[PDB]
């Protein structure tokens, strides 16, 4: 896939694409609840993913937010402070977003691609938190408010390493 990367002042990369997801990935469907972002991030980090593995991710995001809030430019367009931000995202079944990917990527030192679905299993843009190539990073699929994991087609391990 040919990228046109733009490094943003917000602190991550952006690129338009025109991609049939299944030509490159397998969609690993995550539970259709408000924890789906954390499920899909756990799918990229834990090979033996469990139904509660997303909790491991969500707890790390809260500490990542406390560590990196004052140096993360993406926070500046939220309209919240740290105390109010944590009070929202720590709610059970509350929707995760790209800012939580931002914090987790900083804490775990892993690159995450977020592919935005515009029509059925087709993506029109992608954002990257990190520098690593696509095949050695976590890829997830943004589907309205839902998130799924994307696993490279010719791979045997679901999680990265
Ligand atoms: Mg257990």
Author numbering: 5 to 165
Copied sentences from the primary study:
One specific mechanism used by nairoviruses is the production of a deubiquitinating enzyme, termed the vOTU, that disrupts the innate immune response. Interestingly, the nairoviral L segment also encodes a viral homologue of the ovarian tumor protease (OTU) at the N-terminus. Instead, the vOTU’s primary function appears to be the reversal of post-translational modifications by ubiquitin (Ub) and the Ub-like protein interferon stimulated gene product 15 (ISG15). Each vOTU possesses a seven-stranded beta sheet as the core feature, with five major alpha helices framing the rest of the structure.
The vOTUs from DGKV, QYBV, and TAGV readily crystallized and were solved to 1.62 Å, 1.65 Å, and 2.05 Å, respectively. TAGV vOTU, on the other hand, prefers K63 and K11 to a greater extent, while not possessing as much activity towards K48. In TAGV vOTU, Trp73 fits between Leu86 and Thr79. Similarly, for TAGV vOTU Thr76 and Glu78 form electrostatic interactions with Gln110 and Tyr133, respectively. In TAGV vOTU, this pocket is largely hydrophobic possessing two tyrosines as well as a valine. Looking at X-ray crystal structures of the CCHFV and DUGV vOTUs bound to Ub reveals that Leu8 in particular has to be spatially accommodated in a pocket deep within the interaction interface. To confirm that this interaction with Leu8 is likewise involved in Ub binding with these other vOTUs, isothermal titration calorimetry (ITC) was performed using the TAGV vOTU to determine the relative binding efficiency of alanine and asparagine Ub mutants (Ub-L8A and Ub-L8N) compared to WT Ub. While WT Ub bound strongly with a dissociation constant (KD) of 11.5 ± 2.5 μM, Ub-L8A showed no detectable binding under similar conditions. As expected, the disruptive mutants I130R in QYBV and Y129R and V131R in TAGV completely knocked out the ability to process Ub-AMC, in keeping with a previous report demonstrating that the presence of arginine hindered ERVEV vOTU Ub activity. Making the reverse mutation in TAGV vOTU, H146R, essentially knocked out this activity suggesting this residue to have a key impact in diminishing FARV vOTU’s activity compared to other vOTUs.
